[PDB]
Amino acid sequence: AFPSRKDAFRAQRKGAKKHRPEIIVIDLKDHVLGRAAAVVAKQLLLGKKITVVRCEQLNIAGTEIRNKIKYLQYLRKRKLTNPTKGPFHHRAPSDVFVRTVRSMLPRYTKRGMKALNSLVAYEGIPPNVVRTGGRVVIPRAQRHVCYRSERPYTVLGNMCKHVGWKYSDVVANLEKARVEKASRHHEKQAKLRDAWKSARKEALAKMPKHNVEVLKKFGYA
Amino acid sequence: VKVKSLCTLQIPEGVTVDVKGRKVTVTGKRGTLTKDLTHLQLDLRVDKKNRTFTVIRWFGSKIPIACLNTTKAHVQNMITGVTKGYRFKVRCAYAHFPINVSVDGQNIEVRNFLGEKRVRRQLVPNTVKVSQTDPSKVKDEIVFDGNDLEQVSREAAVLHQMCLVKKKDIRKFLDGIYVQTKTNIE
């Protein structure tokens, strides 16, 4: 994680600038857990670097009690002779998603671990990801197109909090502060947004006339 | 399935009903109430001019259709709550040991139930007002007052469930705390 002094020295000798790999950031809020994992697992195997946020807002079909009991049945499975080196049951919603993706990969091959190590999961949206670019969704894994709205569903964070996850309140407080800060920033920069809108509207009267007709033909004016 | 099922409700003059995303707010005199019905998946409309509330289920089988009459009853209860209120009268019935009920501000203490030394305490939420009738009029009566029928009930029910006889023949041991009158404040 933390760069070595040799790595920093080599970069300065090369004189290169800041580098960021092409990373897709997925907002997992109101996404079906299984369908999102299957889509993400295939993309990881195709060499994509994927970061998922708001894992605590994933959805599973059924009542919360039914899915809580499902996790508790998974929790009771452990190597009796030595619970260490036994099955490791992770309670955080981001680790639950990571485990779901891992079971959908060839995890016991080097290629499978290369795909798995290309995925980063978070609860909420941490500051290092907030300003990296627009977030994406998976339309075929979204709740409002996947579930019939009459059926009950569970939120992953609510299920995880009652089976051992201890940071439900921390994530909620951090997410509240993030949205207020983003809303305040978005309440500002409105003048900049409207200034460019009027600049595009006023520019129609300054460009050559035949260029306006071309824009109208292709539905841009 | 049935293409269109609907129920209608008339709104009195002094009360207004607002619906937005299956969230119903009923405002009248003596207070206001709000109900979250985002779990229902119904079509709620309010005709402000004609004072009608309508709930519609499109392409519903028996189970979804059973919910629209429940929705109408809930809105009707809210309308009654913000116009007349709800009053539950509770009587302490005992054979030998008097049931001493102490009612402080929002706090209820029950003592000497079947002679037990344990004190039963209940904290009434601020939306429900609990008062004890003067014994000169009617003996050992407790009155619960509030706008929400759901809240006024289960405040008396919680009181009833706290004074339950254990390890005895309940046919013979009839001591307890029972609701007697369900009425309106005004």
Partner: protein, 169 residues
């Protein structure tokens, strides 16, 4: 409010060989199927459409169920629904998509210069306005430091450093 599925309702076909064509509901079979027809479109004779493949529009002509072909044509012309629909933005976008799909490499170049020309003039207008009332990051920051810089640069010591190092240039 969403537009109901009813006799006389105008719809647009979502997918399939009749994609992005407009028709009239004419009749309703059951919860899943209707009988769309549009006299003014050649490929839009009376036929069955699944309700999952239609998008109701804001226009409904006054026809009865299983109306005659002549009655639908008269109602469609009198209501001017097609003329009204063609003036909307979504109708224009559908025409624009067809124009881009059949476009050549030369027309794609023409659109590219047309959008670039508008982009250039939007910047010219924005920068002229940003000079008067600062709204961008560089003009707002410049205004935020002009008052402090003027106060600090007006000192006698700063003025001595002004000329003594400008003259070296």
């Amino acid at each position: 409010k969403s537009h109901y599925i009813c006799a006389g309702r105008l719809v647009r076909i979502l997918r399939g060989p009749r994609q992005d064509r407009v028709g009239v509901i004419v009749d309703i079979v059951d919860a899943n199927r209707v009988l769309v027809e549009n006299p003014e479109d050649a490929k839009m004779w009376r036929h069955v459409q699944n309700l999952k493949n239609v998008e109701p529009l804001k226009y409904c002509v006054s026809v009865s169920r299983n109306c005659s072909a002549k009655a639908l044509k008269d109602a469609l012309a009198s209501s001017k629904a097609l003329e009204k629909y063609a003036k909307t933005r979504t109708a224009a976008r559908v025409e624009a998509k067809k124009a881009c799909a059949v476009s050549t490499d030369f027309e794609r170049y023409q659109l590219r210069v047309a959008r670039r020309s508008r982009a250039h003039w939007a910047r010219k207008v924005f920068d002229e306005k940003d000079a008067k009332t600062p709204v961008s990051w560089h003009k707002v920051a410049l205004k935020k430091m002009l008052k402090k810089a003027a106060k600090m640069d007006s000192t006698e010591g700063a003025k001595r450093r002004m000329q003594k190092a400008i003259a070296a240039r």
